[PDB]
């Protein structure tokens with residue numbers, strides 16, 4: 001890498017790793033549309049396996065950006081509309097509270113207080129139906145945002161129904177394959193296990209366990225190379241050959257709702273650039289203002305998403321107007337503010 005990129009990355013990340021006691025980390029900086037990679041530490045402490053550019057990390061809720069884009073691609077295909085009632089795709093959802101809750105509300109956490117987590121007791125298609133049927137909204141649709149796996153996770157499951165494909169098959173054929181994300185997985189194949197980092201929670205090696213709507217809400221695993229390619233794709237959707245996918249990326253970066261200084265996309269979240277860095281809790285209910293109609297992807301934005309599982313902490317941020325972006329993948333779930341601080345320190349320096 002150019003020495004400026006080398007220096008700011010190492011001077012920012014080395015101390016982060018020390019302060020947070022992160023066992024292993026991979027970073028990619030996208031600078032004028034070219035990726036530069038950095039790795040530190042261990043993918044597997046016990047077996048002494050280093051982090052490499054081929055190490056798989058759990059992305060946690062960064063997966064929601066993939067779900068949002070897949071949904072966007074389904075809209076572009078004409079298979080679904082965000083204005084469609086949820087019941088159009090799940091007619092068994094007959095309980096009255098569902099009247100007026102649209103796919104947009106699911107995708108953007110504005111359905112009226114769907115909970116952060118699907119309970120562990122929920123397994124089957126039947127258990128899930130019962131869960132959503134029994135759920136009692138706190139609020140009317142489109143009035144408050146409550147970040148939730150059970151909201152965007154259901155969006156992802158319903159969005160692929162017209163396609164006939166499983167969520168995983170749809171993601172592979174419509175997003176991963178076209179973008180050449182050939183080391184990105186919802187389920188890690190046995191051939192790739194050698195590269196699957198362990199996560200670390202309280203010193204114990206852990207991987208994410210199966211749960212309802214996991215693939216849709218928090219279940220993607222990826223390498224630093226594929227994630228840099230994901231960032232490139234989202235920075236410059238017009239270079240993408242598949243028409244509906246190019247459209248879907250654009251739809252995911254549209255601004256649907258505003259709370260404070262932040263705008264909610266499909267998966268992605270955005271603020272106006274330049275952003276006050278300090279401007280960038282188990283449950284956080286916030287009133288939203290509808291953006292009527294949604295603002296198409298704004299190039300002068302800080303576009304980002306944090307992700308976690310029990311054992312992993314991920315962050316992605318990019319600024320389209322500067323052709324600049326960063327991916328930080330770690331096998332410890334360390335505090336969000338520390339991720340954002342480090343990302344801003346690096347991008348601000350390069351911008």
Ligand SMILES: *[B]([O])([O])[C][N]S(=O)(=O)[C]C1=[C][C]=[C][C]=[C]1
Nearest residue numbers: 060061062149218307308309310
């Ligand atoms: B996202 O913001 O990374 C989702 N957060 S989560 O708490 O649901 C991640 C998770 C999932 C399964 C088990 C533990 C933690």
